[PDB]
Structure 1
Amino acid sequence: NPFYFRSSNSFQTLFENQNGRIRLLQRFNKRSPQLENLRDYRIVQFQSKPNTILLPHHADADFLLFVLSGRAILTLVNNDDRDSYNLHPGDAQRIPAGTTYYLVNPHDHQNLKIIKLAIPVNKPGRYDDFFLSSTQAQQSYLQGFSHNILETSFHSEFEEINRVLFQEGVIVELSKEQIRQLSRRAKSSSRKTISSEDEPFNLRSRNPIYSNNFGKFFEITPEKNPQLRDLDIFLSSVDINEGALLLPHFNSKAIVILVINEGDANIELVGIKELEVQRYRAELSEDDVFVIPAAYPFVVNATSNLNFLAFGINAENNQRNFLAGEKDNVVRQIERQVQELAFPGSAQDVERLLKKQRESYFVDA
């Protein structure tokens, strides 16, 4: 379905060396017009083996990075300082546009998987990367000027610079000592960084809204943390035990991008035929990206212990309506005399029915 992007069908390898890879999922709207309100958005997948580093670079696009697995040290250099942040799994952080930064995986046995929602600033849904370093894959951007102008600004004869400023591509392994070094400075998300409009925040920290023996629903919102406010986006980490299932529901106005972080699952989407109804389903493996419109009912059935993260675009004052179950049940709030009219079934017929499934949010399937 236009809403299912196969991690093997819709990714573009930006980089991959014996230390990792970097891919850019196609442009939502480029693939299908139905997702025209996602044009200025791109999903990026970053992975770096243990003991490596992303080389200093900056891009004309905002980044909301999320740490799915492993660890990492995110460092942002400013024109007057620099901040090294300690990012644990589930930790999130906003990396402004045109901000130079490097990534270090200070681990020895755990790979690092990280997803980033990209908000380009010049051309919609299209952005570039500007790497400072000079390598066999990329030429630093400094080398785009003339020897004379570089000569002048740096105060040195070109020769002296082209020898000091102009190593395998952009992902290189540091060394425990190197590693250890560039680390202590690092701050770290905490039990007191939800509101801080700069510090890193972890979604999987506060008690999850929908938690029940067959799964859990983690989410933080624009009204909760300022970084998300500026973007008007909510984030949700959902754990669903194999067998269990997410009761049918829909988002009031927020457009959702979900990315299976691990496991496999099933999804049903019911949108009107372009009056007949229509479904869109797909099995979801690891790394696939599914996008659920707004007010389009969907279900996620976990065919094996699963957890996926979801980006909620257009999330302010969003409301999640559950069609089945007890808590947050919408049809269950529709006056009886109307449930009567609404469906072909005795007023009670509907009622008693509605109160069979006695579990909230996640039921066993």
Structure 2
Amino acid sequence: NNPFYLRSSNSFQTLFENQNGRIRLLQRFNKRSPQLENLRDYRIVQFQSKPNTILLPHHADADFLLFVLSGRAILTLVNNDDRDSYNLHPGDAQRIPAGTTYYLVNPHDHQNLKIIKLAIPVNKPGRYDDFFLSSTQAQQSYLQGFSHNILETSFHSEFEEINRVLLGEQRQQEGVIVELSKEQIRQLSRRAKSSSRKTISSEDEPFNLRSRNPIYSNNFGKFFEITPEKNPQLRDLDIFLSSVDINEGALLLPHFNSKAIVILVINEGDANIELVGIEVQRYRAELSEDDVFVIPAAYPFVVNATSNLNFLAFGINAENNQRNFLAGEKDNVVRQIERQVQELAFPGSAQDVERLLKKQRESYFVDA
């Protein structure tokens, strides 16, 4: 029972689900173990929908940072006088400000849309609600919260008229995720600004995690990363994004983060992870697709790819974070110390220790 390990089978809680897709909400990072108190204000959401669909209009009391793991979508954020549609592609990330009304469309014909997002509530710490404008079989419209009187006066109309149009108390859809008409997708799909290279640093439009070169990358893997330094949207939430791939058989050499708390979500493949903590303590765990493992700050950890892997990671508290490796050539901290100290540190000679470290000729990612 690794506190830092959350099994999907028993850590997710479906909010809405039907034939057109479902939305699941991870559990409270702290409810699991008080050891994760510093994350009580964060949540994990997973959205998956079937081809040619739309998530009816709604807004929530929580900022969101969504990452499109795969598929294609059209995010539309409606304001009080403006509207803005974007065409998110795989690897594309954007930030939906709190209290913003918006809807999602899956223009694709065969492919699905799997979006995973980090939610940050405004009112209740760690908790947030979804307010749907629409009047569906599965949810009332918040407009039904008001009295008939306030309604008759607000819209300037008789109730039966506003009920036979906006509410409907059979004429209303089944759930909040209904199918669309090609003519419609044909019509919604033409004005959504899409991600490009000139967006890496835009306070608005979405940016592509992979559009740039990785930071580390060899025949055994690739580590794509973005930090507040480079992105305005990421400086505000003070978080870093990094999608990293690892070829079956290779692993991410032992390393620790200086001051970032990482939340990695396995996106594809399998993996064996190891976490050391304080007499040291091991915290291994066998992760699978959709599993979430949170790695405390200043904690060495290694990732073993037991099959072609790709995982997403959120770096909470990222401003000026550094990645220290314990093995390999480049960025190895146990190889910068003064010899005499290496001599005094572990039981070995300065040369005997200068020998065991120069063996491994690769850096970052190696092959098992």
TM range (shorter): over 0.9
Shift in Å, 1:195: 1.0
Unpaired runs of 5+ residues, structure 1, are none
Deviations 1:114-142 (A, max 9, x none): 01000000010000000000101100001
Q: 1:348 Cα shift?
A: 1.0
1:37 is paired with a residue of what secondary structure? helix
State the alpha-carbon separation in 2 of the partners of residues 174 and 40 from structure 1: 35
Q: Separation in 2 of the partners of 1:236 and 1:96?
A: 21
Aligned to 1:264: 270
SS of aligned partner of 1:8: helix
Q: Give CA deviations for 1:212-251 in whole Å, capped at 9, x if unaligned.
A: 1000000000010000000000000000000000000011
The SS at the match of 1:192 is: helix
SS in 2 for 1:308: strand
Give 1:353 shift: 0.5
CA drift at 1:64: 0.2
Query: SS of the residue aligned with 2:86?
Result: strand
Q: CA deviation at 1:19?
A: 0.8
User: Matched residue of 1:116: which SS?
Assistant: strand
Shift of 1:265: 0.8
User: In 1, distance between residues paired with 2:227 and 2:296?
Assistant: 18
SS state of the match for residue 12, structure 2?
coil
User: CA deviation digits over 1:282-321, x for unaligned, max 9?
Assistant: 1110000000000011011000000000000000000000
- Looking at structure 1, the residues matched to 344 and 10 of structure 2 have their Cα atoms a distance apart, in angstroms, of 46
Once residues 74 and 186 of structure 2 are traced to their aligned partners in structure 1, the CA distance between those partners, rounded to angstroms, is 11
How far did residue 15 of structure 1 move? 1.1
- State the TM-score, normalizing by the size of structure 1: 0.99
Structure 2 residue matching 1:83: 3-state secondary structure: strand
- Written as runs of structure 1 = structure 2, the 5 A alignment for 1:160-171 is 160-166=161-167, 167-171=173-177
- Percent identity of equivalent pairs: 99
Distance 2:87 2:61 in 1: 24
Secondary structure (helix, strand or coil) at the match of 1:238 reads strand
- Displacement after TM superposition at 1:177 (Å): 1.3
Q: Distance in 1 between matches of 2:187 and 2:288?
A: 38
Secondary structure at the aligned position of 2:22 is classed as strand
What are the superposed Cα offsets for residues 187-221 of structure 1, whole Å, 9 maximum, x if unpaired?
01101001110011011111000011000000000
| Post-superposition CA distance 1:167-192 (Å, at most 9, x none) | 12100111211111111110011010
Q: Deviations over 1:44-83 (max 9, x none)?
A: 0000111000110000000000000101000000000110
- Shift in Å at residue 346 of structure 1? 1.1
Shift of 1:329: 0.3
Instruction: Kindly state the Cα deviation for residue 281 of structure 1 after the two structures are TM-superposed.
Output: 1.0
The separation in 2 between residues aligned to 1:72 and 1:265, in whole angstroms, is 29
Equivalent residue, structure 1, for 2:170: none
Separation in 2 of the partners of 1:264 and 1:69? 18
* Structure-2 separation of matches of 1:319 and 1:313: 13
Please state whether the residue corresponding to 1:24 is helix, strand or coil. strand
Cα separation, 2, equivalents of 1:346 and 1:196: 52
Q: Which residue of structure 2 lines up, in the alignment, with residue 318 of structure 1?
A: 321
Equivalent residue of 1:279, what SS?
A: coil
CA deviation profile, 1:20-50 (whole Å, cap 9, x unmatched): 1101100001110100100000000000111
Specify the alignment match of 1:279 in structure 2. 282
Q: What is the rounded CA distance, in whole Å, between the counterparts of 1:185 and 1:142 in structure 2?
A: 29
- Determine helix, strand or coil for the equivalent of 1:234: strand
Matched residues in 2 for 1:158 and 1:297: separation?
63
SS of alignment partner, residue 161 of structure 1 = helix
CA distance in 1, matches of 2:301, 2:286: 13
- Equivalent residue number for residue 342 of structure 1: 345
Structure 2 CA distance for aligned equivalents of residues 168 and 243 of structure 1: 46
- What is the RMSD of the two structures over their aligned residues, measured on CA atoms? 0.6
- Whole-Å Cα distance in 2 between the matches of residues 335 and 54 of structure 1? 59
Structure-2 separation of matches of 1:263 and 1:214: 15
Residue aligned with 2:270, SS: strand
Look up the SS of the partner of 2:225 in the other structure.
strand
